[PDB]
Amino acid sequence: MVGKKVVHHLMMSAKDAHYTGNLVNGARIVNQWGDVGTELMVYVDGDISLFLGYKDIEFTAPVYVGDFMEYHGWIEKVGNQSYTCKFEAWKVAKMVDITNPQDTRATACEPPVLCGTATGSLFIAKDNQRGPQESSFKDAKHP
């Protein structure tokens, strides 16, 4: 790991439903990993970066309205202009019975439930790199 792990955390609201049955789409996780990756790039080189692509996105558990979700990312390798990052998505709380809209019961997921993993790469053109911006990234070094 280069630098600290970045952790986003938020709730799936009714606005996050995508399919019928209060089911959130897997792309919602990818949206959040894009923002996690951006934060990592701000810290390592002071630019919001451009997202190049992914490998091995795996969606491992369904996500519903009322789930509380965490999205973890970290830099695995600092390249010359490209940065290889790893990502995870975890469910930390949920409604007890999504099928009953009037049921207000909810609980924690302890341990948390793995909902996705991915490897991604981000790019900052050499002329736009500004060096580390956040103290945990100070010994980021390039090849």
Q: Which residues bind Zn ion (CB under 5 A)?
A: 45, 129
Tokens of 129: 């790199």
Residues in contact with a copy of itself by the rule CB under 8 A = 7-11, 13-15, 17-22, 25-27, 30-35, 38-39, 42-43, 46-59, 62, 65-66, 68, 93, 95-96, 98-99, 101-108, 110, 128, 130, 133-135
Q: Pick from 126, 117, 135, 136: which is nearest to 49 by CA?
A: 126
Residue 113, contacted partner among Zn ion, a copy of itself, none, CB below 5-8 A by kind: none
Nearer to Zn ion, 45 or 67 (CB): 45
Residue 129, contacted partner among a copy of itself, Zn ion, none, CB below 5-8 A by kind: Zn ion
Cα distances (angstroms) measured from residue 12 to each of 31, 94, 101: 13, 9, 15
Q: Round to the nearest angstrom and report the end-to-end CA distance of the chain.
A: 15
Query: What letter represents residue 28's amino acid?
Result: R
Residues of the binding site for Zn(2+):
45, 142
